[PDB]
């Protein structure tokens, strides 16, 4: 399920961000800065597949920067489904382009908390980032449900 | 380490218990009851390796009973390290035998919440169960 997977990323990306904040070296923090900025460039060029891959690579670097053997192993284990989930999320976000900045905004609060070495904040930022995506997905479902329900109820 | 792994189970076993409570069939709940009782028998015989395997099998059944494809995939993925973590935890618990009953006690609140079909209680029970183990590990060194 694409639903069950989000709840799992919710859990695992939070802890990833936590340890990344606490254990990232100076080289890690720099390699992450370039990957975070790569997301912005892909978003401004308006290329969905480019931005989707930029996010996947960012999240991998964050996980490696966490230096937690089991977490990295779990990411690699689900990497194909994760890559698919991010791609699907962005297909729905590119439908409502006004949300993209707000999503990147949430993701940037995680990045900034990692660079700053604040674990608690980084984890809470990740929860809110993914929680906010779940909310956008549910609004698509809700409005498309009203769509049919309302246009059918008129007579 | 043994520490990082606990935080990972903390997360994943909570969600496992949640869905197990919500989605377990009658056959699942029964297969889990036999595995839970098997832990008690292994504990009373005082056999560490037997009780360690009983817990591993219990947790697998709980995960399967959750009917959540990604969770099961993640368990299988880390199964070797998980089996090792449980075995190591019990080596430290068998050092302070007075804790064993309290650990089984916490784990039984999860089981009971699953049989009863109460997801939020089952998840909260799992957090307290593993949180309590993390505390015992930190007191060791």
Swiss-Prot record, chain B:
The keyword Signal does not apply. The keyword DNA-binding applies. One of its GO terms (molecular function) is DNA binding. Keywords: DNA-binding, Repressor, Transcription, Transcription regulation. Transmembrane segments: none annotated. Transcriptional repressor for the pyruvate dehydrogenase complex genes aceEF and lpd. This is Pyruvate dehydrogenase complex repressor. The gene is pdhR. The chain holds residues 99 to 236 of 254 of the full protein.
